[PDB]
Amino acid sequence: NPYLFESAGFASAFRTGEGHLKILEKFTQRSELFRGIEKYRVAVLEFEPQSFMVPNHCDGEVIYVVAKGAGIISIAEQKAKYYFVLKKADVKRVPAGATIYFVNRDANQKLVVYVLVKSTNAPGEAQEYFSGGGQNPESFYRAFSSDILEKAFNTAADRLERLFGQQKQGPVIKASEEQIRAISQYASEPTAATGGEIRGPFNLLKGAPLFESRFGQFFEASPELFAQLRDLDVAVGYMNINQGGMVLPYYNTKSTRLVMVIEGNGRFEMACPHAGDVHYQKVRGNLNVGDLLVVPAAHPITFTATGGSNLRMVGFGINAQNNKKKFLAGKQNIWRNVDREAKELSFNMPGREVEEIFQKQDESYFVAGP
Numbered sequence: 549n550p551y552l553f554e555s556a557g558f559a560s561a562f563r564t565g566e567g568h569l570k571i572l573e574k575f576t577q578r579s580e581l582f583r584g585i586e587k588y589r590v591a592v593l594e595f596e597p598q599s600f601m602v603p604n605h606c607d608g609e610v611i612y613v614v615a616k617g618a619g620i621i622s623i624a625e626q627k628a629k630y631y632f633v634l635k636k637a638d639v640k641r642v643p644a645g646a647t648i649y650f651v652n653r654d655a656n657q658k659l660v661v662y663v664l665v666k667s668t669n670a671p672g673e674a675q676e677y678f679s680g681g682g683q684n685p686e687s688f689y690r691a692f693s694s695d696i697l698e699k700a701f702n703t704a705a706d707r708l709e710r711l712f713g714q715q716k717q718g719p720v721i722k723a724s725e726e727q728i729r730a731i732s733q734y735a736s737e738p739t740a741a742t743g744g745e746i747r748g749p750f751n752l753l754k755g756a757p758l759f760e761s762r763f764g765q766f767f768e769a770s771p772e773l774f775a776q777l778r779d780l781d782v783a784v785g786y787m788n789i790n791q792g793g794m795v796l797p798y799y800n801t802k803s804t805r806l807v808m809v810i811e812g813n814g815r816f817e818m819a820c821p822h823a824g825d826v827h828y829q830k831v832r833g834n835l836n837v838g839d840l841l842v843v844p845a846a847h848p849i850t851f852t853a854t855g856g857s858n859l860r861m862v863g864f865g866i867n868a869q870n871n872k873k874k875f876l877a878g879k880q881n882i883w884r885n886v887d888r889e890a891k892e893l894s895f896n897m898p899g900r901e902v903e904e905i906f907q908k909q910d911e912s913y914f915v916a917g918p
């Protein structure tokens with residue numbers, strides 16, 4: 549099964565006592581089937597209580613989704629400073645090359661963010677550039693010659709050796725309660741909101757889901773409605789399947805989805821046709837917290853919640869503009885927009901009987917699972 553990337557298969561670019569980054573392999577290293585998603589990476593960042601990330605920029609465009617906890621993100625640009633508060637299920641776009649850091653200000657709970665990265669240059673390559681730090685993480689200022697740094701900073705070499713030579717604790721480090729309180733104060737300060745500014749986070753569970761029943765909900769932030777997604781042609785979806793529920797089988801017309809488990813457990817089945825006559829392989833598996841599943845566009849799929857909790861999933865939708873979900877069963881489904889004769893011809897069954905079978909399910913979207 550090339551579609552399922554267990555959390556264990558993720559690579560760990562850094563790990564400290566205060567945090568870690570896990571990132572998926574370039575999808576094209578797994579399979580040539582993934583040439584369509586070559587520009588994209590998925591990562592998980594975790595911060596321990598009272599932690600701070602050394603300032604750095606990512607060369608890729610980034611979307612962060614808060615999976616667990618609470619915190620702050622700050623952004624330092626040439627001509628602007630931002631602070632935003634991050635809560636569970638908030639989503640935040642960070643422009644490529646923006647210098648950022650995070651703070652987990654909570655004393656007890658980890659802050660866990662799931663990350664989509666879209667490359668701009670070579671497909672799928674993603675790198676952090678530590679402006680902060682010194683020895684570990686290595687600051688990029690150490691790449692420049694001393695004669696250059698001295699002129700640039702108008703300072704003697706010995707002050708610069710001290711400046712870039714004392715950080716050794718790695719990319720995520722402890723911050724004191726007091727340091728945190730002071731950053732919290734700077735973050736709560738009112739600013740002048742301009743046009744052209746980086747936009748703050750939006751809650752994915754805000755307002756009305758795109759569809760629901762008693763057994764689940766699908767929320768989505770589409771690129772049509774969110775300018776900070778529009779230029780990447782990305783949608784962010786949130787699937788909340790009630791304990792013991794399922795989503796009815798469906799396909800996305802246009803948009804391949806990179807699906808990460810937030811909470812709970814489940815399983816899935818997908819149909820995949822990837823000259824003799826077309827055959828659809830059964831792609832099947834289980835899902836745990838932190839797993840990634842690639843759901844290619846046009847592929848029929850169902851997710852089943854298993855265990856004693858809801859199955860909660862976030863999906864990064866690519867090529868998302870005008871995407872729709874075609875449901876394959878339930879009251880509201882594609883066959884409602886097919887007339888009798890075509891049902892009859894299609895299944896070689898008298899048409900009224902096809903209608904009867906297709907209308908037995910009075911519920912839509914989500915139902916009691918097997």
Ligand SMILES: O=C(O)c1ccccc1O
Nearest residue numbers: 785786787805861862863
């Ligand atoms: O949009 C999807 O098909 C999807 C599926 C599972 C989880 C989140 C999602 O956005």
Ligand SMILES: [Cl-]
Nearest residue numbers: 892896897898
């Ligand atoms: Cl017939």
Ligand SMILES: [Cu+]
Nearest residue numbers: 820821822844
């Ligand atoms: Cu396929």
Ligand code: NA
Nearest residue numbers: 892893896897
């Ligand atoms: Na017929």
